[PDB]
Symmetry: C3
Subunit: 433 residues, 3 copies
């Protein structure tokens, strides 16, 4: 049985050992902040090693995937993927809103009882959306590989912009799509670039295979340091009903809505598809990042589920960037819970604008130093609530982010198969002629 | 008639509509600073899309152009282009000085009457020239793609340098020329690099062709927001004679001096050459940037005027970087006008040093966050005037910069044809053997 | 005799003329700080031109060298090189410690008599080593080409990290080694990348050949400005015995230890090997940088000593990065001298930990804005001395750094030949089959 499922067994054992070690250490010892930081060093090393891979993999994969297909086939496949992503995000938002409204978690809990943690950023909604469009079209290609643009209102007001660290994934993907479309039409004139980027993609995948050897040791310390950070369980008991509502929404979505759509589109049992993606699901639940787990999702979807490479290389990065089913559900539930916490009544129009803002904000927001907090503030402003109410939820974000990430990865994995089945005729036509 | 001149007709219609919209909006409505900024969003998007193209196009074009020619042919062509650029800049400076001296605009106008706008930077002349030489030879190739070097005097004085945003075009072009010279001599060993950069150049040109579709909508809002910014026309009336002198100099240069030299060198009617470049001229007059309009100039000069690609790819980027006929004329006229504004008499030696400083400063200065203001301050210091007198002219810089840009582009376009005619024998000899 | 040794003769003449000019200028004239800075402009230009070459040369050379060999041959060659580097650094540290202890320079000199210069940085040992491991694995490939990571302790303490300028050579070399290993195994799939990087390496070497023409003029002003900076010779007389001890250690190492090991391993006379590397030795003694002189060492070792390119391309960059025989000897001598300056007795265990800290700190530290000062502070903290005692030695660092650099380059040059002789069978086996 070994030498075939060694990676999965090692990951499971590392997760179990890390949970046990975190519980034992935190319970039977007292550590300072500096010692707690020093305890999680291998996890940080694994984090930066996985971050090192994102740029070459995304660029080469997008260019190769777009360049392989014809222009007409590419347009159709992209349209189907976009429609699927939008529909799934909207359904997730609707389910979240319905659940949080029905359960009514915030009615009993008082605002004064709940403690406050973290700091609230200052957000302008229009400036945030305009910054999103600006980052769609960067000014410098080299700067976009490690930096992003942001505008702030300053003084009777003037807008001033600056650049800060953090890779601009959206602009890079837009440019990679346009470049692959252009070099596909050149034919014999652009073949050398196609070969260059194909070789680069293969090399990056082999490097990821190398990193997979060290992954378990970093995973152990990552989950252990996640457990050690929480000082007390009283806040967890105080936020029990809200976390239960969020987890119920995520579980219902992942177990019912996506498998039902998959079975309706492609007449196959979706649980074998989910079993194929189990390794990527555990990776997403541990690392808690959708872009860093992309090569694992690539490998799972291609080797286990026998999905076509032409569909996968195109679909997976775009889904990793713009498909946020777990996030939008979270935002909606948190917004309505905060509204119920105060003595504020919610009308039908308020629910509608909350849903629209959550759907657009999650899809648009691909990466920001504080992306979730900014989008949560935007939703709260849309409903009219103060931005300072975000502090109430921050205590359990480190715990819920992992489940949100794994839900996003599951959505992308299901979507790749659905789009592959939808465009079965085009692939046959293209390969025969 | 359509489907052949659609781009030109759309650009003309967009310019007319933008002027009309700007006039109507500013006259029949009152807007705040924030609303004025929000009104020009499509123009800013077009700006950053055009800036995204500069780096790959310049690098690939320079490498391909130098690598195609032989070393001896390259040296001759470069020498002819450099001599033409220097001579045209010197003639422009002389014409400017003669005109501003003859008209005497500053005699009547009092210094106290003219209002003051903007902020005056602090400039050291020797430090500025040394920074120019430093930027000729950058320390890092990756950093030079999006940043530039500057030194300031601080304390009995010590020099401290730092890096700020803004692409270092001069250093990139120097390195690209050296690299293309080196890989041309390698022969069979460097062929793969030649193929790589040829394909990159073709892809970049196709991407520019894509951007040309959205250009008109951005142009409309660019010219409209340019018109809306000016608060009142009283300052325009107060600076009427100075603007008239500058426009007279630019028009005389563009209509007489360049066509005469072109007709003398190559026995052809230069107005058909200008008609071929009309699209690039309108692009430069709208965007007001010489580097961003380079692909349009490439396309016009190659498709319409049937200029050789070997000459064009070498000549156009260098001219875009170091040929500043419109700027030097502006600087000279502004300097002498400021001198006439005060009770200061100008001697022959003062005129000579003004002309020399304007010629060297404009040619050397290719790109700086505030390039024109810094060079104007340098010229004022050379004649001995205070740097605070720059504030008087800033009011109409946004209007005059477009005409200066279009004059620079026209000079480059004429120079490419003149150099092509001068080196007709070398091309034939190289292609036969 | 000319046209064959023109570069060497020009360099020697430039060194002599620069020493003469520096002595005459400083003695018969008085210059301000600004004028002293302006006097060394050509040297600074040569400095930045040599820095421009490091990134492409290192990346292409490492990728090409690793990709050429088989995986098993690569592992053996790397292991032999690593063992040689560690052994030579340890021997250098032991010799330094023995010499400084025997001579006893600090017994007579009082602490109060010695003047203090410069500023002492704040260093945390554990944070420094963790930063070294972090820089081994960077987060962004584009950012690693011009920036480095550093963590500081801030407030009951929290760790905050930031990025500052300075190329991350260690992370780039680790990635280049892994990439070359991966693309070597791909075979026919990775051939285009191999060709690309081979051509890039050849082009970079030709560009270095171009820079060699301007090198002498910059060297003259570099050595002249080095001489002019020192205000008085009294401090040199006060630090005479310490400088004599350091120079004795360096000379003994370079003349006895390395040639003896070379002769023992490969039965050849090592002084002809040293004569071959004379040009690189003078380059290192003038520029005082090990990475900037790497192409000169490449050319000397390949053309003059007939060393195999497969061994050289692999060995020389790693040695330039991690082989610091001169530095560790310096650190040990300085530490023990500072200890003798105070009324502090040194035990055997203290000597052992000093030697271990010097050996590990010099090898690990490849490049930092203040690398020597930080490692000296680390050693002083390891022995328990205050970090403020570093100010005593800074006066002669600009003089001693050149000798340290030339010792490092000599060690790398000897190591390449020793490793080539050790792995003679593998090369024959690989080329026959
Ligand atoms: Na979705
Ligand atoms: Na996703
Ligand atoms: Na000119
Ligand atoms: Na120009
Ligand atoms: Na060593
Ligand atoms: Na070295």
């Amino acid at each position: 049985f070994l030498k075939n499922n060694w990676v999965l067994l090692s990951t499971v054992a590392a997760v179990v050992l890390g949970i046990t070690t975190g519980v034992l250490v935190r319970e039977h010892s007292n550590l300072s902040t500096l010692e707690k930081f020093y305890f999680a060093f291998p996890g940080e090393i694994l984090m930066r090693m996985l971050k090192l891979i994102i740029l070459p993999l995304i660029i080469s994969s997008m260019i190769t995937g777009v360049a392989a297909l014809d222009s007409n086939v590419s347009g159709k496949i992209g349209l189907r993927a976009v429609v699927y992503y939008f529909a799934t995000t909207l359904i997730a938002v609707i389910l979240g809103i319905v659940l949080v409204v029905s359960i009514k978690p915030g009615v009993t809990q008082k605002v004064g009882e709940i403690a406050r943690t973290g700091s609230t950023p200052e957000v302008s909604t229009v400036d945030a959306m305009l910054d999103l469009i600006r980052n769609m079209f960067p000014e410098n290609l080299v700067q976009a590989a490690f930096q992003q643009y942001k505008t702030k209102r300053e003084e009777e007001y003037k807008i001033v912009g600056m650049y800060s660290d953090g890779i601009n994934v959206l602009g890079l993907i837009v440019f990679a799509l346009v470049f692959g479309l252009v070099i596909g039409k050149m034919g014999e004139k652009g073949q050398i670039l196609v070969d260059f980027f194909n070789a680069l993609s293969d090399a990056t995948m082999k490097i990821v295979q190398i990193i997979m050897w060290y992954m378990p040791l970093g995973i152990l310390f990552l989950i252990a340091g996640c457990i050690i950070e929480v000082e007390d369980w009283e806040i967890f008991r105080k936020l029990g009903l809200y976390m239960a509502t969020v987890l119920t929404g995520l579980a219902i979505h992942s177990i019912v809505i996506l498998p039902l759509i998959y079975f309706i589109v492609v007449r196959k049992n979706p649980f074998r598809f989910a079993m194929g993606m189990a390794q990527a699901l555990l990776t997403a639940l541990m690392i808690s990042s959708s872009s860093a787990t992309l090569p694992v999702t690539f490998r799972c979807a291609e080797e286990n589920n026998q999905v076509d490479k032409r569909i996968t290389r195109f679909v997976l990065p775009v889904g990793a960037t713009i498909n946020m089913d777990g996030t939008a559900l979270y935002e909606a539930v948190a917004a309505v819970f905060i509204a119920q916490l105060n003595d504020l009544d919610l009308g039908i129009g308020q629910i509608i604008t909350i849903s629209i803002t959550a759907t657009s904000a999650s899809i648009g927001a691909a990466g920001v130093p504080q992306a979730g907090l900014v989008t949560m503030v935007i939703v709260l402003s849309a409903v009219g609530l103060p931005a300072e109410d975000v502090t109430l939820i921050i205590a359990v974000d480190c715990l819920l982010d992992r489940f949100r990430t794994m839900v996003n990865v599951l959505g992308d994995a299901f979507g790749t198969g659905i789009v592959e089945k939808l465009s079965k005729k085009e692939l046959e036509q293209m390969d025969v002629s």
